Amino acid sequence: SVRVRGQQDNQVVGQLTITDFVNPGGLEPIGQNLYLPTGASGDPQEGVPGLD
Amino acid sequence: SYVSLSGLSAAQLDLNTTSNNIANANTYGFKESRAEFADVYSNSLFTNAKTTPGGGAQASQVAQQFHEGSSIYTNNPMDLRVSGTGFFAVAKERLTPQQNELTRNGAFHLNKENYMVTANDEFLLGYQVDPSSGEVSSYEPQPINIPAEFGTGFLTKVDFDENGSVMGTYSNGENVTLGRVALVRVPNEQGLDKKGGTQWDSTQFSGDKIWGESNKGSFGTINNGMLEQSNIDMTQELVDLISAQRNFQANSRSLEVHNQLQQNILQI
Amino acid sequence: SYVSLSGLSAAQLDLNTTSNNIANANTYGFKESRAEFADVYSNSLFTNAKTTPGGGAQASQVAQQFHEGSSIYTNNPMDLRVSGTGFFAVAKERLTPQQNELTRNGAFHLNKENYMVTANDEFLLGYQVDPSSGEVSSYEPQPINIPAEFGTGFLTKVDFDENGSVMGTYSNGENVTLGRVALVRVPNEQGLDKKGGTQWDSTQFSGDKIWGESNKGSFGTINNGMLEQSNIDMTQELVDLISAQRNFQANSRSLEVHNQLQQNILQI
Amino acid sequence: SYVSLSGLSAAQLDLNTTSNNIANANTYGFKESRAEFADVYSNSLFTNAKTTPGGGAQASQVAQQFHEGSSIYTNNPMDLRVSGTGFFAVAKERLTPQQNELTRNGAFHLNKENYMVTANDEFLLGYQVDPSSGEVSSYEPQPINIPAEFGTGFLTKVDFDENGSVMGTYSNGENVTLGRVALVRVPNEQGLDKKGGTQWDSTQFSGDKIWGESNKGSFGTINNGMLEQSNIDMTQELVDLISAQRNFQANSRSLEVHNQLQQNILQI
Amino acid sequence: TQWDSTQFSGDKIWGESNKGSFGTINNGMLEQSNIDMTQELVDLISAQRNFQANSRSLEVHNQLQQNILQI
Amino acid sequence: SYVSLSGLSAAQLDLNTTSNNIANANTYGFKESRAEFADVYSNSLFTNAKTTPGGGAQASQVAQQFHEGSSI
């Protein structure tokens, strides 16, 4: 959310979604602090953070 | 040994970034820098993928953290500060105001021509407003001139309101608005490339300069009689100096072990 | 280690500027100084624009803050003070008054020639007015002379009005206007170069000298029986003295941490 | 070291919160702030849920305790104080009274147009009531104007009753009600975002502004000739200075032991 | 102790004494300062204990940087 | 340390204004002065104001209280 000058309430600009893996150790690191899902990692499951 | 040397380089870069911050603890308008690192992972078609030791620690980018610095009070009407988001426009040559740079410190004064210039004899840019009109008429930035005589009457006091307008009262008791300081903002401040003298220039990654007035739109307010010190914290930098020294020693110990392995084989 | 050494130089420069102000806490007409610093971010064609940390801190301008100093009362008609904007004109040689320097202290007296001189036996410059005329006849500055006998009549008392005119009453009760003290102003006081004994000279960055009368136009008034002390604040200088010490100690800590890094590798 | 660093960050914030409270010991209408901290702890699926330390201390929120401050008597009818709950409505621009901000200090006066404005030349908002009518007719807030000539009659004295109405008596002996100061309230004063100069604005967490008169409903009264000092206690803040320093030193001692323990293994 | 008109003070309003909003003029009387001696002396006390506290805050921050500077 | 120095400067300005009032206890026509101070709250796009303290205290304006003085 962001605040616009001269206006109350927070104008929502977007929604961040995080992904979970059953086995995070199976991810293939490709450098730059990034991972790619492999067979051992499992199917990525998405959702809103803080829930599910 | 190349994994350890990358670790030594990353820590040494962290020390230099912290040392640069500590060195500028008194420079006005300074914005601190933070060293960011990334991982290295190189694999081939013919390289085993299950066992993937890292390649070390790569330097990602030295940031330019742009949080607001604290204000020091000087009681000088020519010392200015931006309270909020926005930069001053400063041109090296008076004739061409397009070749301008962004700055955050406001140690200004008047030259022999009574132009509002910085410490580096560089001209501050502002909007041209008519003495009788209100808001900006022509939006093209021009150097701000405070005439000694307007009428006639001689310049006596100069003050800046929250709108950035420089107003001069003269001996004839005639208050005339001489213009308002132009405020510049970019969508990506961290994308600006750093010149000398705590000044920045617009880049491809920093978006386009947004010309605007103070206390308008997304711009902050302009305060005279104030200056912005460095936005660094001495406590944070000293502790960060400690952590990178511990990190440097650990990586050099790893380099020492790797050498003693090769010495051990060399004696078979 | 060069970034840390730049911080030590900047921190010690702030000490010298502050120590100079504290030493001059009693000199008349002293204007305090403020050390201003800038960043050093130099680059080349073959250097990464992403992973270079800064070059340290660079000294910009050791300014000379020209806010009005507080006034002391001595009840001495030969002691003068400029209340407002303006400097006194003082020439080392009586014959040549063009070779003159600007001063702010009015500790004046009469030499054996009855010329109003400074403490350094340097002559005060003023405008020549006819005894019967009004304003300045010839604007060329000439040394101020108070004759012992005018008529005859012997000098009894000397007083200065707000217009700067020196009036000397004699035994025969003849009030004669013997001249008026010249006041000098420059568009850029910050550009004045500093000579010895709280005296300045005009430069190219300070503009040209503006000769005018006191309490005329932008010039301030002249008060006799008063002197200006230093425009420093002891509480502010003592606080800045503390802040400069931690800015030095932290930089030396940063310098210390980098010699321990080199020592660590030197023992592999 | 990160749990130790969390303690240093938490304690230093407590130092800054107390330092800001002490700095505003004389500012009118100031509301003190308190630092609130929380625990850090996260456990992974692959981490032992029993034998694992915590994560340090994380700052929860810096509160804005809104208890009533003490009152100082100035015997100035233009100085106003709200005794109880309520805020003055202050608009930056006269033309638009919708862009308004809340305040607690009541240092008001008249500008050249005889509008009741604050020290920042910002217009106080009040209700428009007819001279012969009683309660507020139109609830929309407008800047309060005190005409110099009403009839005609010239402005002689201005006083405020317990209802906040501004009453002006004139030379012709005509007592006219010029309006009443508008009072603003929010259900959650804690959610107000803090602007500069002891002024607040409505946010999403503070609800919507509730407009009303003084001494009506839940609103407090308006007293002229009084102001509100800071709501801080010198004894409490000075004691908190000691406790936050003792808390900081213990965390730095905790940080020193860990550095010492990584040096111990480094020399095996 | 003299004032001059400014932009924030409006324009000078010329009028006679005891006319309109203007006050009367009394001869044989002079106006002293509008200060209260007891009020200023008490304000002197309050300002000194508000400068001591702020100096105490300045000391504790300094002491805390010295604490880190010896690790 | 700048927040503490803001308090020192604010407290020192009040002392100077009070000293000016006391010095002019006998000057004719003098009108007393009162020092007014305000708060400091500077926040940018990148700072998380949820837990960030103030900037100290700042001067609003040294006033010129114009109440009628006693007559001699």
DSSP collapsed to 3 states, A1-52: CECCCCCCCCECCCCCCEEECCCHHHCEECCCCCEECCCCCCCCEEECCCCC
Residue type, C4: S
Residue A28 makes CB contacts below 8 A (sequence gap 6+) with: A35, A36, A37, A38, A41, B49, B52
Q: Exposed e or buried b for every residue in D131-146, given b needs 16+ CB within 10 A?
A: eeeeebeeeebbbbbb
CA B125 to chain CA mean position, Å:
18
Cα–Cα distance measured from residue E52 to residue A16, given in angstroms and rounded to the nearest whole number? 50
- Tell me the three-class secondary structure of chain C, residue by residue: CHHHHHHHHHHHHHHHHHHHHHHCCCCCCCCCEEEEEEECCCCCCCCCCCCCCCCCEEEEEEEECCCCCCEEECCCCCEEEEECCCEEEEECCCCCCCCEEEECCEECEECCCCEEECCCCCEEEEEECCCCCCCCCEEEEEECECCCECCCCEEEEEEECCCCEEEEEECCCCCEEEEEECEEECCCHHHCEECCCCEEECCCCCCCCEEECCCCCCCCEEEECEEECCCCCHHHHHHHHHHHHHHHHHHHHHHHHHHHHHHHHCCC
Length of chain C as a residue count:
268
Question: Angle at the Cα of D246 (from D240 to D252), degrees rounded to 5?
Answer: 135
C-alpha distance across the termini of chain F, in Å: 49
In chain B, positions 58-77, which contact chain A (CB-CB < 8 Å)? 58, 60
User: Which residues are paired to B80 by β-bridges?
Assistant: B106, B224
- Alpha helices by DSSP H, listed for chain B, are 2-23, 234-265
The alpha carbon dihedral of B233, B234, B238, B241 has a sign of positive
Tokens 């000078």 -> residue = E12
Torsions phi, psi for B181 (to 5 deg): -65, 130
Q: Is A8 within 8 Å of chain B by CB? A: no
| Structural biology method used | cryo-EM
Chain D residues lying within 8 Å of E7, measured CB to CB:
112
Cα–Cα distance measured from residue D110 to residue D89, given in angstroms and rounded to the nearest whole number? 16
CA distances from C27 to B116, C69, C124, C187, C230 (A): 31, 11, 19, 25, 6
Looking from the CA of B91 toward its CB, the CA atoms found within 13 Å total 19
Cα–Cα distance measured from residue C79 to residue D256, given in angstroms and rounded to the nearest whole number? 62
Torsions phi, psi for A17 (to 5 deg): -125, 135
Q: Which residue of F has its CA nearest to E40?
A: F18
Chain B residues lying within 8 Å of E68, measured CB to CB:
235, 238-239
Residue type, B73: Y
Question: Angle at the Cα of D198 (from D193 to D201), degrees rounded to 5?
Answer: 30
- With beta carbons less than 8 A apart as the criterion, state whether B85 and B218 touch: yes
Residue type, E62: N
Cα–Cα distance measured from residue C185 to residue C87, given in angstroms and rounded to the nearest whole number? 6
Cα–Cα distance measured from residue C255 to residue C9, given in angstroms and rounded to the nearest whole number? 12
CA-wise closest residue to E47 among D18, D234, D238, F10: F10
User: Which residues are paired to B138 by β-bridges?
Assistant: B128
Count other C-beta atoms under 10 Å from residue B45's C-beta: 5
Interface test with E, best of F9, F22, F65 (most E CBs within 10 A): F22
Residue E28 makes CB contacts below 8 A (sequence gap 6+) with: none
Q: Do F12 and C235 touch (CB under 8 A)?
A: yes
- Tell me the three-class secondary structure of B162-205, residue by residue: CCCEEEEEECCCCEEEEEEECEEECCCHHHCEECCCCEEECCCC
Cα–Cα distance measured from residue D10 to residue D36, given in angstroms and rounded to the nearest whole number? 9
Interface test with C, best of E48, E52, E62 (most C CBs within 10 A): E62
Residue F64 makes CB contacts below 8 A (sequence gap 6+) with: F31, F33
Tokens linked to D160: 């405020």
Residue D143 makes CB contacts below 8 A (sequence gap 6+) with: D91, D94, D97, D115, D116, D123, D124, D125, D126
CA distances from B235 to B25, B98, B232, E66 (A): 12, 41, 9, 10
Chains A and C contact (Cβ–Cβ under 8 Å for 3 or more pairs): no
Cα–Cα distance measured from residue F7 to residue E70, given in angstroms and rounded to the nearest whole number? 28
Chain F residues lying within 8 Å of C243, measured CB to CB:
1
Q: Is A8 within 8 Å of chain D by CB? A: yes
Give the closest of F5, F9, F43 to B68, CB-based: F43
Cα–Cα distance measured from residue D155 to residue D116, given in angstroms and rounded to the nearest whole number? 14
Q: What is the CA radius of gyration of chain F?
A: 18
Tabulate helix, strand, coil % of chain B (nearest 5): 20, 35, 45
Residue A29, judged by CB atoms within 10 A of its CB (0-12, 13-18, 19+), counts as middle
Tokens linked to C164: 């700067």
Chain F residues lying within 8 Å of D33, measured CB to CB:
53-54
For helices F2-23 and C234-265, give the axis angle rounded to 10 degrees: 170
The alpha carbon dihedral of D21, D123, B223, B141 has a sign of positive
Count other C-beta atoms under 10 Å from residue B30's C-beta: 26
Give the closest of B221, B235, B253 to D8, CB-based: B235
CA distances from D218 to B255, D105, D184, D214 (A): 72, 20, 11, 9
Cα–Cα distance measured from residue D75 to residue D223, given in angstroms and rounded to the nearest whole number? 11
C-alpha distance across the termini of chain E, in Å: 58
Torsions phi, psi for D36 (to 5 deg): -115, 130
Residue D193, judged by CB atoms within 10 A of its CB (0-12, 13-18, 19+), counts as middle
CA distances from D194 to B147, C93, D18, F49 (A): 39, 63, 17, 9
Residue type, A14: G
Query: How many distinct helices (H) and strands (E) make up chain F?
Result: 1, 2
Residue F70 is given by DSSP the state P
Cα–Cα distance measured from residue C129 to residue B184, given in angstroms and rounded to the nearest whole number? 54
To one decimal, the resolution in angstroms is 3.0
Q: Is A11 within 8 Å of chain D by CB? A: no
CA-wise closest residue to D103 among D113, D115, D95, D117: D117
Chain B residues lying within 8 Å of C84, measured CB to CB:
none
Residue C167 region by backbone torsions, left for phi larger than 0, else alpha for psi between -120 and 50, else beta: beta
- With beta carbons less than 8 A apart as the criterion, state whether F49 and D61 touch: no
Cα–Cα distance measured from residue A51 to residue A10, given in angstroms and rounded to the nearest whole number? 22
- Size of the E and F interface in Cβ pairs below 8 Å: 95
Cα–Cα distance measured from residue D4 to residue D11, given in angstroms and rounded to the nearest whole number? 11
User: Which residues are paired to B110 by β-bridges?
Assistant: B116
CA C226 to chain CA mean position, Å:
17
Count other C-beta atoms under 10 Å from residue C82's C-beta: 26
Torsions phi, psi for D59 (to 5 deg): -70, 125
CA-wise closest residue to C151 among C182, C118, C173, C120: C173
Give the closest of B221, B235, B246 to D262, CB-based: B246
Count other C-beta atoms under 10 Å from residue A12's C-beta: 8
CA-wise closest residue to C122 among C184, C191, C197: C197
- With beta carbons less than 8 A apart as the criterion, state whether C46 and C68 touch: no
Residue type, B95: L
Residue B128 is given by DSSP the state E
Cα–Cα distance measured from residue A3 to residue A10, given in angstroms and rounded to the nearest whole number? 5
